[PDB]
Amino acid sequence: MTIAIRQLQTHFVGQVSGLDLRKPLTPGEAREVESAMDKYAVLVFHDQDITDEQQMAFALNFGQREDARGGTVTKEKDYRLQSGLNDVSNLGKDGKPLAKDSRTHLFNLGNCLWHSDSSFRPIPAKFSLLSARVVNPTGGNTEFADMRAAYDALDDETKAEIEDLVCEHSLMYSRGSLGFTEYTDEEKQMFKPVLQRLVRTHPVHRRKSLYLSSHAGKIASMSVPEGRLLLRDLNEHATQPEFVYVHKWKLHDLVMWDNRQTMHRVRRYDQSQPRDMRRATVAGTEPTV
């Protein structure tokens, strides 16, 4: 009836055991994992030595593939992986680490900022599923923040202030804060800003949460300076240690998160060493606006 789950942080995060992700799930098991995703927001599976196909098959229990187009500087040519998965590694087509100053790596440094995946899309992602294929031993922890806990801890005046606010999300905002400011020219059209609610409501349990993300570069109804200051304050509030779970990677871990309830980021790592990390993304169902 229930799968084995141990909670890893005071507010959220469950560790799951007893499931082999190389193999199909039963209807009951898929139902259990999704309820755990609703409750815990982040799930940690150890020792899941899976193929790209096995990983995506697992993800497809929970919806459909998110269309990857408009998500990277993909050159419209080709890259490393053959399957459905998003390549979130530090490797080129080469199979070995990207150059310190390449346009691909510099864009990938965006992942070091606190973000919710595909928040730059009119329908943002539901679940993201990350598999560790080669572990970089010098840094690159992945950190998760509970946006519902963060929301709850705000005072009434803040909650009343932010309730109806709308943010503009774009890859140009997140990469822009890192100094990556030149886009040509269908990129400016491909990364055209989308609207998202600052405060969102989960469809299952109806918990309210802060929809924070590096992609959010302004609040619609405010001046750019004031809006950004507010977002900075909310981001500082929401990423305090009491709302954060730090994941230390082991080989063949799978960590999956609900983008609708969380932010995440990768910490600085040594770029000269391989880091083979591969993501499956489940498309969102409904927009926030």
Q: Draw the binding track, 249-288, toward ligand OGA (x: CB under 6 A; -: no contact).
A: ---------------x-x----------x-x---------
Contact yes or no for 254/55 (Cβ under 8 A): yes
Report the DSSP beta bridge partners of residue 134: 276
Binding to a second copy in span 137-176, by CB under 8 A: 137, 152-153, 156, 160-161, 163-164, 176
Whether the CA torsion 236, 238, 241, 244 is positive or negative: it is: negative
Residue 136 within binding range of ligand OGA, rule CB under 6 A: no
Of 234, 34, 228, whose CA–CA distance to 150 is shortest? 234
Q: Draw the binding track, 97-136, toward K ion (x: CB under 5 A; -: no contact).
A: --------------------x-------------------
3-class secondary structure per residue, 211-249: CCCCCEEEECCCCHHHHHHHHHHHHHHHCCHHHEEEECC
Tokens of 27: 């209807």
Residue 223 within binding range of a second copy, rule CB under 8 A: yes
Find the distance separating the first CA and the last CA of the chain, reported in whole Å. Answer: 37
Among 93, 221, 287, 289, binds a second copy (CB under 8 A): 221
Per CB under 5 A, which region of 14-22, 115-123, 166-174, 240-248 contacts Mn ion? Answer: 115-123
Residue 7 contact, options K ion, a second copy, ligand OGA, none, Cβ 5-8 Å cut-off depending on partner type: none
Residue 88 within binding range of ligand OGA, rule CB under 6 A: yes
Please report how close the Cβ of residue 88 comes to ligand OGA at its closest, in angstroms. Answer: 4
d(CA 220, CA 222): 6
